[PDB]
Design a protein around this ligand. Sequence first.
Ligand code: ADP
Ligand code: ADP
Ligand code: ADP
Lengths: 439, 426, 314, 36, 202, 447, 102
Amino acid sequence: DVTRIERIGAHSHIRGLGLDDALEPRQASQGMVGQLAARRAAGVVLEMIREGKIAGRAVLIAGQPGTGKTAIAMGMAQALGPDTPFTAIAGSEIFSLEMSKTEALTQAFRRSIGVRIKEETEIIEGEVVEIQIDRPATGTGSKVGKLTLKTTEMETIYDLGTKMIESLTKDKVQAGDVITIDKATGKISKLGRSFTRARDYDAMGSQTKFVQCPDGELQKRKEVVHTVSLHEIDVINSRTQGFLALFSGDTGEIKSEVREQINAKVAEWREEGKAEIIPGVLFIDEVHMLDIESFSFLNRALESDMAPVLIMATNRGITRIRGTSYQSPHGIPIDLLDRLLIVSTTPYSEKDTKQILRIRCEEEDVEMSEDAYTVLTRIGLETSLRYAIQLITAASLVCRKRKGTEVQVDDIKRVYSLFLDESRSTQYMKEYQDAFLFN
Amino acid sequence: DVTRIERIGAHSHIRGLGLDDALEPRQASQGMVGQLAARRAAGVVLEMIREGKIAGRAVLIAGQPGTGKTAIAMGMAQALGPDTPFTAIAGSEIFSLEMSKTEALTQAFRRSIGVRIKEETEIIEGEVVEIQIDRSKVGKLTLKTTEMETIYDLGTKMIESLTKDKVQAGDVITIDKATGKISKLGRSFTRARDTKFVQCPDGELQKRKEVVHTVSLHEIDVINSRTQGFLALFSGDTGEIKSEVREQINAKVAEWREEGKAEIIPGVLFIDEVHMLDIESFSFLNRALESDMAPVLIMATNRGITRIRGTSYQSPHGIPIDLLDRLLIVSTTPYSEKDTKQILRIRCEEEDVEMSEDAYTVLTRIGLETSLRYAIQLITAASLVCRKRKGTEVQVDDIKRVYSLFLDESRSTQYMKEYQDAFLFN
Amino acid sequence: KNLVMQFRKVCNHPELFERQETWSPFHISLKPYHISKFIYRHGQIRVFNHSRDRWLRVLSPFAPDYIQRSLFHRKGINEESCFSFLRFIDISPAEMANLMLQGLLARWLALFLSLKASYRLHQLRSWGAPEGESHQRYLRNKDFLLGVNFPLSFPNLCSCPLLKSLVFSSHCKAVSGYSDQVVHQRRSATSSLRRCLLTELPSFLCVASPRVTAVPLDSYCNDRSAEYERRVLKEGGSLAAKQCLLNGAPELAADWLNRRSQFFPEPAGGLWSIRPQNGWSFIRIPGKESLITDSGKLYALDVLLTRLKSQGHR
Amino acid sequence: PMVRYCSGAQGSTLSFPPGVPAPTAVSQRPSPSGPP
Amino acid sequence: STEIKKTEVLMENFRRAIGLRIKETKEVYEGEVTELTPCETENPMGGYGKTISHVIIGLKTAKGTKQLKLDPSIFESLQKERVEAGDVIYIEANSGAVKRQGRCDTYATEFDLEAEEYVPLPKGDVHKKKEIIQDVTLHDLDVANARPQGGQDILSMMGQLMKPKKTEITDKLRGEINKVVNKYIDQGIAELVPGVLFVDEV
Amino acid sequence: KIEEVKSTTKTQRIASHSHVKGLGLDESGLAKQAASGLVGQENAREACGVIVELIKSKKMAGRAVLLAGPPGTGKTALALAIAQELGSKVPFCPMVGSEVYSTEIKKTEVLMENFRRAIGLRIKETKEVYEGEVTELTPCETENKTISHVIIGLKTAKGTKQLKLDPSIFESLQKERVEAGDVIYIEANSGAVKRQGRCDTYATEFDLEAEEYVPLPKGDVHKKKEIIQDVTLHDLDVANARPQGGQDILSMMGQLMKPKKTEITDKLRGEINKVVNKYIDQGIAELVPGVLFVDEVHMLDIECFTYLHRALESSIAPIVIFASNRGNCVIRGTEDITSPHGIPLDLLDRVMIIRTMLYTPQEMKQIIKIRAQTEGINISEEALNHLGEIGTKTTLRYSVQLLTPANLLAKINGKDSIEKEHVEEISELFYDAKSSAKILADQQDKY
Amino acid sequence: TISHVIIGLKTAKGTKQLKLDPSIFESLQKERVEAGDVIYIEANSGAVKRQGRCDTYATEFDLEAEEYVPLPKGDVHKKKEIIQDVTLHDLDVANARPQGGQ
Ligand SMILES: Nc1ncnc2c1ncn2[C@@H]1O[C@H](COP(=O)(O)OP(=O)(O)O)[C@@H](O)[C@H]1O
Ligand SMILES: Nc1ncnc2c1ncn2[C@@H]1O[C@H](COP(=O)(O)OP(=O)(O)O)[C@@H](O)[C@H]1O
Ligand SMILES: Nc1ncnc2c1ncn2[C@@H]1O[C@H](COP(=O)(O)OP(=O)(O)O)[C@@H](O)[C@H]1O
């Protein structure tokens, strides 16, 4: 019933590259189907990313529009999992007004190297039985006091320190709250009231969800893993109390010496075993948007031990490199195109276009007749794959509007007459050549 | 030996625009050689700057690349010396990302005209012989020169300075009496016992002395623009200074000149490589050269008839005819062989290197074949090859080595043609 | 390698041979920038032009007189008056004048008073609903301040403990984002997983430092009054302005002194509202973990001692 | 010389040492006039 | 835009076209305060001159009067706010903090002038409840996390006196907000209503 | 008897130049055929041999060289070899030509930041400091009252002292919330307090507290030390332009506001030069004028090339290394002026050009071998001969870049080492710039 | 305890008493003026300048951190008719951004 923030998008059916353990692609697996040559190569670079021994590698995924270049990149984004950082950038997103193009690429690079930190801390986790706090009659400002803390199995009294009385009072703990004090940091945290002390109670000083009393021993340990990128480590270090610049995006053009010092101390935290640096991926999707200035930054940014394994999609033939008059392959300068390995995707057949539409209906929660799949496969080769994909939703909705249980060929012949293919819209743009503006 | 910040650069061997008091250039002096036309022309200009009576005046030093147009302007700066404002900026140095291109010239003029004043100041200066303080406060202090001794009952606002700056017996101290700042200079050599040590001051303790101070007209613009303007003078934090603030400061400095209360000290703006100001920037110079507080403008350029920036129009020097009419053009000249050799000699005195007279001969031939600045670079390189060889002096074969290792442009371009399709974008 | 006990010392722990000293930025102080007595006395446009500057303050529509003459003494019934909005923001004509002519101190104190007033406005605005502001017609004072009506405005957010938790980036904390957290019991070795909860960043990510730190470049002058102006500035310009930055408002400084004695004080607002993770100074005392991380033997000894402690061996 | 606040189990409790005022004085509303 | 890059203005409109619809209780105590009555216990605890188990507060509205019993820690907040009898005040039942609105309108005739705006006597009961369903786009969450409004710190006041500049919000904040609203949709607190971004003149 | 052996830390990551360890010259300044990681390029390496003696001589300022030659000829490899040859003690400042295009500061000033950053400086800074447990703390009022003096008691393992200090130090201690029994540090130069923690003598005083308890300091309460600071002229310029030292409310808040760059005025650079010349006269300083390396120089804008005429002629400037991979380009910002290496002829006089040239197949075999054993892989001789063949068919970088995919396939199908069948397979999985430009020109109707 | 301030001024041309309002006296207090300082008051505008201590007190101590200046040789009280030139742009710019006042 309920719908979460992520929903059925252009690639939700993809769940990995669909390789076997011998690194050969299956014909259909994890939602990817066909496209064996590029999926094989994608497996090798994915295994190179997970090996991580080597730096500043680059890959370009070439081929016609609508042939899986972004699909294979999502496939290896999913097969790489959540724990190893993958950054999607569309090539246009570097044109900032906070900062230069070369800053925006340096941030996109360093956002794609993880530093993984285990934080292990003791938490005192308990129901508060009582607090007492003592104030001097006017005094110098020193306090004193005692907690009494409980589980279903334990009780103990703690003689309180003044640097933590200020936190108990700041966060307004009261008898019958359940709390989780991080004893390393001194920080309080509150989990709700225990069920009893809301009965023996004043006119309401609090109203929130209850929680059961904590179990077992009163003093326990917690483990948290943070995957903190080099970019947010630079931003935290760029000024004191910089933490809102992680979300707000406020810091442009971070001082080079901050990066230079973090490149040193992250290497030290590896040699000290304090934090594990993990390589990752920068997917510069549609990279034919980079100005030649930005490509020429990659040429020397891509040659440092702190570079991620970057991947670039492109759909462009021999074209002028953006910001110049120079024609080149992929719209990339040969200075950069020499620094990478090119994986070329290939156009689809019926035998895999039908199979892509078949997995797509299975992700979109749709049933269609085999006659409807046959006609939609024909539309998906008379016209591009993404058009046929989109007709699935409209066909399922048109069928549901007539109270049908399953899509039929006349629902697709309906929808095909109703939402135009570009090539048919471009045809009707001829008979109205006087009426559309600026032909 | 120890290294300055200021090490041996390209122009550093010039220590003045070498001239006789007839404004006549002798063949080589004060570090610089030849240009017997342009050095005399720069001599007349140096006297116009130095006399200062005419305002809004300009000269364009032009000629082939590597014919001293930057060099004679560096020699001119050295001959003008300290204490008469000279500012060199490159033509591309005005293209700010916070401040208008036009305002950056408005500001670059004003760095180069000084306001000079002289202030009579009461300064105490002596060895402190003894110092006592009670428990308000009262205290008593004794001061000495090499020639006299004195005792002073201190006032409260000195006690709260001598105590604040931890002054002790045997220090040498200078005090601006109007303010009580303690400039401690060191300790006397007899009380260095049990880390700067110094002789006690001479003459009497309390001297009235004239302090003469020079503030650029821009340095008066900036002090007036913020709660503490002068920080933005160092930090660059201020740009687009309000034009009515300059309008008032001109009217003020003009009445100080007319009361004789301050003397304005005209100077030089040296807008090096002016060939790439925009037509907008030249249009500002067209009018900013026509105001009584404008400095002498010296401009350097190495361009033929060229498209002026921000336009399709072509004109001499890459400067519009509009601005070339304001100014006097001095042509430098391409060097002869004897001049080229003699320049290479004085560079070797500055590099501190010996080489044989045939080595100077082949180096002169190289310098004529490859436009001088290349031959100057080979001096440095060849001396380093000899130092690797443990040789005392640059012999011809050590130039023939370096001449094979480091290409000039003309050979580099020729060896690039035989790889024409391996390089990108041509 | 570039007689023997030196090797043994270094191989045991390098602090037997060279201790890590406390590093700190190189501290520099340029000579103070010298302004002559003359430019200080005659050269400042804020001073030599003060008589003319009074007319810029007098010929001003922000004078309380002119605000009243425009706001309440119009000729037409309908007529085009500026300052009409001062009837619908809670602003006196003298508060508009003071806010325009007393500078950033009046801005800051009027802002702090507007933060107080926002909660008072929010209550009335979110529970009052009869008829209209008077007999079902007219506006009322404050009714141009609509920025409180947003669900996510700080009063409504503070009033609503679910929405409070969706606005998690408090400006004085190191929040990294959400994660799982695993809790281990000392009994049973059982562990269990807490789903998405807020996390601080680890307290040791903050390690950068300028190689150089400079004393703020200061101006010297040859004049007794110039000394008083710079002394007063270096003391912090007034007790109001200094407390306003240091404690957040002068009311919060007056409270801070006696919040000392209270049980449930509210936070300080100025620079003392912050505690940066190393203190304000960039000086690095070498951490106690450096004893472990500088010797492979001392690290090996620690995995042994923790192994032996877990086994219970003396 | 200490004031003490107990957040207690069956109820809260604030306590003042003898001779400290207990600045918890009562406040009660005084009456207005009949008509304005 | 001149404040923020072209692609980020698209991303903001892609985040305005998705709404939370989140429901919560507001519960509040409000009224003219008729008394503050610290209730002593008949015995103090040993070594103390007197002890208070609760403060009675009398509140009233146009519907009626009642006493409330409140935790003794309230009394400091009742002198932080300059509370005195015949003020009108409120207390958030989910938080226990007390706030002062002003002298009640009943007393507006007790002087010819006084330097405080009188507040009309509240109506409905002293204790109020409603559930209210509040709509925020994910762009509202993105902004409220990118530029905090709870300004009791130097960074927030400085950031609120300075120009309110738009900023290039990071893919990380979008990530953390997607991670939290999924919690509240799964917990059945928040509905999500995906919607439409319409661009004319594309 | 039994042994234990452990080391869990990962290596450094292998980068595209990390086999370069030095120029591989002999003591006479001639090139070895292959040494210190490099192969071939004998003239270009012997020329760099003159330049590394130029740097170590310190005598020159603003001398500059242009490494010029086709893509993949090792230009950045020779400039990295110079960086290794000079060692860490001299600053080598790597820069890319398109980094001058800041949005905070002018192009004609980003170059001066890099020029001032490449001039290193070693300072014998004497710091004098107080540290200990704060056993006592008493501020003193005096008459116009205000706080005017501070009494502090400090304690160490070497006894105790009572020190008398300026009220700015009390305001600093109050800011750091220092209280009795804290352990602190105060350098008297900056007046900078650090709270080290709470003294470990008190670690038993509570059952639960937030503090870091720390052991009592050693040696005297008051002591002086020399720190051998390494610093660059840019670090002096920028630290004075937005000051964060001292302890007033202003420096304390220039530490919070966004750290925007600013167009540093030449008056400040001048006053820094005067100050550091005095540290050099005083024997407190040694100058170490280093190298600026501008990779991809061919896209500095013509504003920048015309600034470099003035910058390279400064008596202060570092030695400058440029690289270009381009022919007779149109120069950026000129609309339609063409010149060699993409650099204006007017600048091209001011540089010693080091021409760098295409490898023979034998130099490619030899680089690929030296590269493979640096990426940590074993390769059979017929496979390496097949990579050498691919080098003749394509380019050095593509040939090198097949190595790690080939090793991935080798370990995936269970081998120890690369066989020719792995390279021959990888050559079909991944296209190159030359072979892609066939399929992409053949199918041109579809993109 | 506040109403207005009587002040006495003296020069080598005579003496006067002025009747300063408390908003002038707030500036004498801010200038750290005391009896025996040499002062310039501009009665239109409340520009108050301390000019150092009168040199009849230049022996109050033997050495003190004040500049001492001779008693003015000019008239105690100078009237000039003056004319202020002020552009509409000065009025705009001096009002549109909150004034310094600092
Ligand atoms: N091999 C594939 N397996 C499954 N779906 C595919 C495959 N190749 C393409 N598609 C689908 O086709 C659509 C367009 O492909 P995409 O990669 O996004 O376009 P493009 O090639 O231009 O980058 C997507 O919905 C994608 O999932
Ligand atoms: N008259 C001269 N005397 C000495 N050296 C000169 C002279 N003229 C040119 N040079 C040399 O010129 C070199 C710098 O180029 P320069 O001639 O100033 O270029 P340009 O004329 O184009 O501005 C310096 O190394 C300097 O030694
Ligand atoms: N002489 C060499 N000896 C060893 N490795 C080299 C040599 N020349 C180039 N390489 C290596 O081959 C690749 C290409 O050289 P590089 O410096 O990147 O060329 P480019 O001049 O185009 O920037 C790099 O991996 C580099 O380290």
